[PDB]
Symmetry: C3
Subunit: 212 residues, 3 copies
Amino acid sequence: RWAWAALLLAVAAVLTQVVWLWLGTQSFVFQREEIAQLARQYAGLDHELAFSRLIVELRRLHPGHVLPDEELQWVFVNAGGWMGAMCLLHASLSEYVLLFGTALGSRGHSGRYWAEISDTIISGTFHQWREGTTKSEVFYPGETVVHGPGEATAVEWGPNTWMVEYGRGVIPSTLAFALADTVFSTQDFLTLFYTLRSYARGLRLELTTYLF
Amino acid sequence: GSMQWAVGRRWAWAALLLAVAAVLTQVVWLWLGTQSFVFQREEIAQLARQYAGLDHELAFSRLIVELRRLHPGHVLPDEELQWVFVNAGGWMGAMCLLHASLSEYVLLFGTALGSRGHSGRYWAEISDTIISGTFHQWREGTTKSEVFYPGETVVHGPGEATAVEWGPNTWMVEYGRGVIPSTLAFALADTVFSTQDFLTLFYTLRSYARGLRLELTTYLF
Amino acid sequence: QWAVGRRWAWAALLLAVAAVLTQVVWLWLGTQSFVFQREEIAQLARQYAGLDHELAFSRLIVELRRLHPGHVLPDEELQWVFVNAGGWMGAMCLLHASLSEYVLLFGTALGSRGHSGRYWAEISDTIISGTFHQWREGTTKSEVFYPGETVVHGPGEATAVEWGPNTWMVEYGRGVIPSTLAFALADTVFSTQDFLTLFYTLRSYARGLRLELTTYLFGQ
Ligand SMILES: O=C(CCCN1CCC(O)(c2ccc(Cl)cc2)CC1)c1ccc(F)cc1
Ligand SMILES: O=C(CCCN1CCC(O)(c2ccc(Cl)cc2)CC1)c1ccc(F)cc1
Ligand SMILES: O=C(CCCN1CCC(O)(c2ccc(Cl)cc2)CC1)c1ccc(F)cc1
């Protein structure tokens, strides 16, 4: 039975080599500049119509990578002491696209992610206070603010602020932050389930499109 | 030779046991049909809408007086009235509990600084009648918010979730019907995981205990 | 010579340990010394309020190092680190920290609101710039504080605090400092999950403790 462990580790090594080669040779569906430009073109419109136009355009530019209307749902998000709402359009293990915002405004922690985030503002204001600094910057509709991996900032969204977000990195690690206040502050298990279901629907779509 | 009108005593005993079993299992159900709420659903709102024109101090005092006059033995006395902090859903305010049962509660809530956060999903229906200030509500699934001013009442259905914002110096009365302990579970989340203010935990639990003691001593006398 | 009961000598040793512990606690309270006076940090920081908060912080650090050498962290150990607690978020820079005392620069460029925290310690805060809204427990009114003023937070008191944009202050705290650090990391653990900030805060406290120990044993 000593060779059974050798066979198990051999199969495991070949499988891990497959996984490594696949993770290495994977391309990305979206480009940061693509999402940024699509969101900047629609910043002048009201956020409802801008969301609609951007979703239609994303669907026509990358078919099979945008959730259908039957699976689009606004879901609240409580994290880092702030509260907003998001609608997920695309979600994989390495990429995500969503619409985020708040009609009341909010303030809190940006989150320390293993990913690169890009928020292009459709309406409102985005105040960012970078770590180690004593001043804050402000971003207005049409501008794009980037969150590098391992960075943490303080964030402040003014009333009626809405943006398009494109994240790229270790996506399953970000759920730990985005659901922290849902577990320990709001105890909103229904919203937790809705978020997990949106993520799973995005994964399902990506898998079926990759398999055809 | 047995008369067809007689009844065996053991069968009669067992049949009376079955009869009391059925009668008890039937009248236990009617307890959920004879449910009596101490306050009407819109009574608290129509009561507080009258004192909205005054400052919150005098308004609270006169409303407490009138509520004691209307429902004697159902409002906590001046000895047990206490302002305690409430940290929940990422917002912070203060409450003063006037009535508390396992299915109903009434309190004076508000904030002198303003706050924002998550309303919470309760197994209960909440009603907030504004005495002073502003109340901003952002319902789930929408991308817009509504504002409520003194005199108006905001109704929060069971299972609903909204984002909320209280401006500076907002004060309201509040009435709630449903599983009150489940809502107390939410009202103490940030007190445990954010503020660590165990004295506030003790204060809120003591207010609830005083309300329950008053509701039980009124039922017995 | 005679014997003592199994419960007799037990209660006798209980009383002996009680006497020893009580008199030792009293002896420790008698020998308690504080590096900074109760109103020293506030008086010193009020002199720099109104200036640019950067210039004020630099001059205050220089002055504190001049007045108490060996009790202020060196430049290579000063670091701005975020703090998330009671629903509010800001940034701190620790200048002095032991088991009984601490001195820091606190503030936020965005403003925040939350729970002050209930401590076993007396905490004074002298505003360098910005605004400080306070709401005391049991009241329905709030008091505003402007630069130059000092807000005192007594042991066991709990208030609702609000900092306006670009609010910066100097803070001196005296009491059970570990119990205040416990509150200082609540949201960092259960809300932000920023383990790097947790490490930074604990490392700053450890550096303050190390400096205090070295100066106590070797005299700065
Ligand atoms: O919703 C999220 C979490 C992103 C929050 N999202 C990132 C950080 C943010 O706070 C930010 C701060 C500073 C900067 Cl510079 C840029 C972005 C904006 C909001 C999510 C995560 C996983 C998932 F499957 C679905 C949704
Ligand atoms: O703390 C509470 C619950 C009331 C919170 N109180 C109601 C919900 C609230 O979040 C709300 C938001 C929006 C709307 Cl529309 C209505 C109500 C505002 C604060 C409590 C009170 C007494 C008790 F024994 C146990 C718990
Ligand atoms: O404990 C802390 C974090 C200070 C937060 N610090 C708490 C009190 C504060 O929140 C406050 C509230 C109300 C009032 Cl009135 C005044 C001050 C201000 C900020 C610490 C930091 C470094 C260290 F090495 C040891 C301990």
